[PDB]
Amino acid sequence: GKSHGYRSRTRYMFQRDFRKHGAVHLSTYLKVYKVGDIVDIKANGSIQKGMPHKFYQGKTGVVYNVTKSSVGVIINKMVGNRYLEKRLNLRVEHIKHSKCRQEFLERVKANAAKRAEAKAQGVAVQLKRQPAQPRESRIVSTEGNVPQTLAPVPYETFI
């Protein structure tokens, strides 16, 4: 018959990285997590307690609860034609701070700095990111860079 156990099909997912076995470094346990923080889930195979299910591998959520050695995380899961809220109790070994928004904080700080700098004299501070734009015109000099002619080469075996 078929087999659909809890850790089914996780042969490679939960393995340790090459030459990275053994105990966890202490910086994992020294980080602080607060309600509202954004974390991403990556299970560690050497810690069998408080381990997430394989579905949540590589997912990102928001902390809603803090306990002695674990945190509570909220994940939106697509079931059928809708999304359901899932709450996970995970030990800190299996999570880390997400940088998908930590990089966004500095853009907020820089926007305030640029707004205040131009507040006294400037208008239209233009605090909006823009996509890559088409290149403008330029002049290409041939001084010391005379074009080299190329031609297709004949077929050769050289086996």
Binding site: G72, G80, N81, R82, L84, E85
Partner: peptide, 23 residues
């Protein structure tokens, strides 16, 4: 195709979420 007739609804977000499971 059936799921996309009316589905794929992002969950509605509320201020003051429920405190179920909090310590």
């Amino acid at each position: 195709r059936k799921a996309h007739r009316n589905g794929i609804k992002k969950p509605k977000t509320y201020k003051y979420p429920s405190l179920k499971g909090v310590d």
